[PDB]
């Protein structure tokens, strides 16, 4: 029950929160680069 | 007791044969009996005065 | 050993639901031949 | 009436009497809220809860006045909304047609048997 | 018998609240009255304005 | 009313993050005046 | 009505006055007496005041709420002997009782939902404030997150019913009928968690144990009945789809009743065993609710009324051994017939009320519930006999092992029984035998 | 402590009831008032009120109307219990071409 | 009455509940007549109680015609739709018990 | 933040620039107002006593000028394609406009600057950042009619903003992650109404003022710092912490009302799956709200004993206790409100 | 025992005062044009007093 329940839900949410803190430990240039790619696919499709 | 629990094959066999299988067999039996009585009720094979549990 | 008698009276009441009044003495000599009253009699015989 | 006319549903006949609490609920609720806010301020500063009753009187008067003003504006807003709905029903008689009322006897639908 | 001290005089506040709630219920049953003696089960024949209301 | 929060309970809130990993265990807390 | 609501609203300033703990329960029993007086109710809604009205189901549930809260102030003298926050405790109890009265006397589905999910915050406050365990955080979070996770999509279902129908009133929504799976799951599963299932129960035995005595009364007395009241209001317009999907819940509830009745034979806590005992009887309530008979609905209402008294009275009995023997363990609680012999009358009188008993309202609720479930299918006679046998197999175990045998060695000296405790367990059992007299009151809400 | 101390107990050595553990005055007042608001109000006077409660449900009226109806129905002799909710001539059933393929439930 | 009106639905539901309680008392008094026949004619209950038992069985049959299989939530419209479907099934399939 | 009158000048010019942004009838005057708002929000978010505030202002500058130039480039591209400011059939240039607005607002594909900047600020510039600086981009998002970008942003905001706040024990990053989740409820309201968004934004702003005033007067920046906070009566600390339960969306307090109006309007607009995706991902927000509420819901704690006096501002805490009362007793004012309709 | 006797004694005084000195009503046919009140529809004097002075009528709630 706690597996497929509250304890394993808390463990999976703690693991998902721990693995998302590694996304936020990077420099600003990586996230701005991700925005620049999202502009880049949005302009490639404007050609097509 | 959750801290010493791991999803092994023995635990899966115990949780299947202890809980889920009697629930599944009982639900299948209840659905089969109610469908067999309900098709006889909806078809019209039983009389009005000869039906069990009239709540009378 | 008497709780099984309690649940047998409970099921006997649940099958005397068919004839309504649980005063069985007015329906004994009439419905001695019915399957529902045979179920009632089997449950109350198991109870005794 | 034997017709389900959309214009008479929004038209106020005047048979609806307002309740006793309807004109007076918002000023007394906002006055009690102002008195409780002054009591909350006096509790947060570790003052006595009924010390400085001028703040309680001013907060209650501000609450009563604001509740009466915004209740009158609320009533004018609902009157304008009702006028908008009646005007759009009157302007478009094709999209909202009078619909004949149907007795239960004409309809035949779905008893759900429990058994 | 029952024992009530000087602190039992503080119990007039819930009785005042009970009186306020009873007055609001009386106002609610005073308002809710367009079907009074006009329903088809507890109805009254012609001349209902001369007779007293039932409730 | 018999158990109250011990310093063992507030030990888990004293880190730089709530759930430490092998990367964030070597981190330090920010200054308590936030400057 | 508005008299009871304004009575509690003007009983709110009683908490802020010092040395005013015992007057509030006096006025609560007085308003319970006044609510005993106002009993002119029939199956339709009466005493219509704005959005507040009352029918017979709502009358019985508000009267049970008032009795449970009035005894809840009587049971908690440990809050009064210590300098634990009596004003906050009284304010939380009055606010929670007011929310229960407001969610039971609700004319519509939405106000019922609003005060229904307002009620879980004072229960949260009692569990995390006045309990005596390190796992109160595990207790309240399980309760709040279970009920909130399954009750948030019920709000989407409620406004889908409002958009399809137009109204929020129970009677106008009784006319309509829906043929959707997801609307049925939304409007049912929140109550299916709020009353204990087998699969979704977890919040119950881990929230009854770590709470206070007052959390135990408010959880096993009236907040396992919010889901029953909600299903009694929702099932009327979802009959076709619940007739398609009710065999799964009835089979799960019956097998789970047998299995949880097998759990209580392997339980070493007094307060946990009554917590699992609430699962078994409400399993019979859930199995009799979905058959939609007259007898199933009437016996479900009777068994919820007769269970909210007896489970709370059993939870007061486990508290008066926890206050003296120092632990809730079943090994420690042994031979209390030689320690408190006058209490053993109330132990067996409230443990017999948990099973079928001769004068109690629980038997009249259990008889009218087994009628509908045996009428539903003949295969249920195999597992109703097992469940109703195992119910007294486990319920006699708690009285037998706690109240008979050799004494636990190495127990220190504690106080004797008190008149307040005898009065507290008097009012949990004499309503159970005085309500078979005028039982057409507390059964025929239809 | 000696023999004459136990033979005549001191009035200051008082055993409390369950309500208060600080002074004897608050025990007696709360005990008598709590026994007043539960026993002789909610259990005796309330039960006397519920004994002579009127027909809120119409069960007594149902029995009287059933006796009068069984007096008048067997005098007419048409039916002791009517099987039909309305008259079979008053109800306008739809035709077979009107229904088509609709689920008729019995 | 019409579908949009809820005044008629409350009144017809209330008279359906009242007629249900009256017909329940009809069946109860007709059962008590058979019980008093069984007690008063103690050895010879086989012969004399037969018209009363036939009348009671006809009462149970007619009660199950009108209020049978309606459930706990039996509105006045639910019995009317059950009567509509019962009369349609009697028209096209004959009496119930020998239907196709 | 009132150490100088020049900061009051910067506050009124950032108010003026935001009002120029939200009232511009063209896509270029909105950019003009965005640059005015940026110029007046660079000196706030910068101070001499805090070292991290200068690099946080550098992060804010690079994030906003990256977003503003893409907003200008796509608006000029829209004007080059069709010379009116509106667009008949929606295309990729509106997608570039909306993505440049989402970098300004802080939606979850572009939100990674937001708590990383929030880790080194004060509690008043944070109050300006999550409340007033969300006015200028979100009021321009309402002019576009593409659905799937808003759908992806709402879904990603309510999962990423709720899960990512669990690991954070700093109060500023936790409030930033909570504002990211409350951002997604605002964009979900923007697809169905332009008034329900104002309802949710005004009361979310109200909850932001009353909750960030608790951490600004008493100078709280940590979860462990809440346990050592000394209040003279523990009932007052228990009562003051009900704003977390209020902002989490619990029915007796205020803050249930705007979320409930969003639920009412979304179900009436036949959008059920996205509502379920948000409300299964708002329980985590109440979980890290209740993790804050560990420090007040219990009635006794193992306090540090060197501090025995509670020190506080007078005017700010006088303004605080008015708004704390309406944060928990504000559902009585639903009868007076008429702006839902 | 004290607090059940203090309840029973005024209750039993009221019960013998109602049955002996007032007494229950006699059943009779309704006269034409009477239009009887709600408290006329019960037999016992305590039930009549409760239905007249305390409890609301069925017609009012209906
Ligand atoms: C209903 C709730 C109550 C009932 C369920 C309770 C919990 C039950 C858990 C359980 O049974 O787990 C079994 C099982 C346990 O596996 P295990 O043996 O412990 O682990 C072995 C592997 O590591 C397992 O591999 P893995 O799980 O790491 O690989 C897949 C993983 C890969 O991802 C990762 O590893 C982490 C990635 C970053 C996570 C944080 C950012 C997420 C951003 C959102 C992305 C999707 C957005 C949606 C789409 C947007 C565009 C349209 O991706 C996901 O799990 C996607 C989760 C997306 C977030 C959902 C949040 C709740 C929304 C409501 O887990 C699964 O089967 C995983 C599937 C998801 C289960 C539920 C998770 C809830 C949180
Ligand atoms: C665990 C949750 C309950 C599972 C059992 C209840 C259920 O779903 O019954 C539906 C059905 C009941 O079966 P049924 O009655 O629908 O099957 C009818 C089959 N025919 C048509 C051939 C006659 O459950 C199953 O079929 C599967 C049961 C569970 C299997 C294992 C699940 C592990 C998780
Ligand atoms: C809705 C409620 C309607 C209430 C209508 C009656 C209100 C009467 C208020 C005045 C009398 C109160 C009784 C009394 O002695 O008060 C002294 C008490 C105690 O005064 P005190 O002088 O002992 O102060 C305590 C000491 N400090 C300040 C350090 C904490 O004061 C109050 O009760 C003032 C608050 C009034 C609260 C009114 C009820 C609503 C509460 C809602 C909570 C949710
Ligand atoms: C800061 C508070 C702001 C309040 C709302 C102001 C109006 C905003 C708005 O857009 O209005 C138009 C909207 C909608 O109206 P509208 O959209 O029709 O108006 C547009 C036309 N104009 C602007 C020209 C009039 O109205 C509201 O929002 C009114 C809601 C109620 C406002 C009052 C709430 C508080 C009530 C009293 C609280 C307690 C007082 C006592 C204690 C005091 C303690 C200090
Ligand atoms: C499962 C969760 C995802 C469901 C997604 C589909 C919902 C949908 O769109 O329904 C539309 C359908 C049909 O809606 P409709 O009838 O308005 O259709 C109108 C037609 N369109 C949409 C084209 C304009 O809704 C229903 O059938 C009624 C239910 C409405 C509320 C739906 C809530 C979704 C959540 C379900 C949760 C169930 C379990 C709850 C307990 C456990 C929680 C974890
Ligand atoms: C939830 C609980 C809330 C508190 C409840 C407190 C107890 C209230 C009990 C009220 C019912 C009651 O006692 O009714 C009296 C009942 C009411 O019944 P009655 O006298 O009206 O009889 C007609 C009612 N039926 C059809 C059900 C029989 O009084 C009696 O039955 C009189 C004889 C009592 C038996 C002897 C008792 C000891 C002397
Ligand atoms: C099948 C139904 C399952 C329902 C699960 C409901 C969530 C729940 O109960 O979570 C409990 C959990 C707190 O668990 P806790 O006791 O604090 O953990 C001890 C250390 N492992 O609390 C949490 O995990 C908080 C977050 C819950 C998120 C729910 C929605 C997820 C999507
Ligand atoms: C280069 C190789 C990869 C190309 C991937 C192209 C994905 C987008 C395809 C497309 O046409 O997306 C547009 C579409 C919305 O457009 P449409 O639905 O046609 O009309 C508007 C009315 N809904 O749909 C959308 O705008 C929604 C998003 C579509 C999928 C986005 C894929 C993102 C790819 C990775 C980006 C990572 C971050 C940088
Ligand atoms: C909890 C304990 C019980 C658990 C198990 C319960 C099992 C119930 C099985 C019966 C119901 C399902 C099967 C029948 C379906 C409907 C068909 C039907 O009506 O069959 C009746 C059957 C055939 O007889 P028929 O000719 O139709 O008419 C009867 C009189 N002539 O009529 C007969 O066969 C007559 C006898 C019927 C069964 C009576 C006994 C049932 C109980 C048996 C166990 C207890 C016995 C006593 C204790 C012994 C062990 C200690
Ligand atoms: C909703 C949830 C409850 C909100 C209010 C919580 C009040 C808790 C309470 O009962 O506090 C009692 C307390 C006793 O005083 P205490 O703080 O212990 O003094 C220590 C001195 N060093 O403090 C007091 O007695 C003084 C503070 C009383 C505050 C009363 C607020 C009244 C609000 C009235 C309007 C309510 C809304 C109407 C719309
Ligand atoms: C928490 C607990 C939640 C439980 C939720 C249960 C939801 C599933 C319900 C299943 C169900 O009722 O299935 C009925 C269906 C047969 O229905 P029916 O249409 O009558 O059959 C057609 C006959 N020709 O039967 C089926 O469709 C069979 C279902 C098989 C499921 C297999 C699962 C394997 C794992």
Swiss-Prot record, chain J:
It holds the Pfam family Proton_antipo_M. It catalyses: a ubiquinone + NADH + 5 H(+)(in) = a ubiquinol + NAD(+) + 4 H(+)(out). Keywords: Electron transport, Membrane, Mitochondrion, Mitochondrion inner membrane, NAD, Respiratory chain, Translocase, Transmembrane, Transmembrane helix, Transport, Ubiquinone. GO terms for molecular function: NADH dehydrogenase (ubiquinone) activity. It comes from the Eukaryota. The gene is mt:ND2. InterPro entries: Complex_I_Subunit_2 (IPR050175), NADH_DH_su2_C (IPR010933), NADH_UbQ_OxRdtase_chain2 (IPR003917), ND/Mrp_TM (IPR001750). The lineage of its organism: Eukaryota, Metazoa, Ecdysozoa, Arthropoda, Hexapoda. This is NADH-ubiquinone oxidoreductase chain 2. Changing residue 277 to I: In strain: Oregon-R, SP1 and w1118iso. The chain crosses the membrane at residues 8-28, 60-80, 95-115, 121-141, 146-166, 195-215, 238-258, 273-293, 321-341.
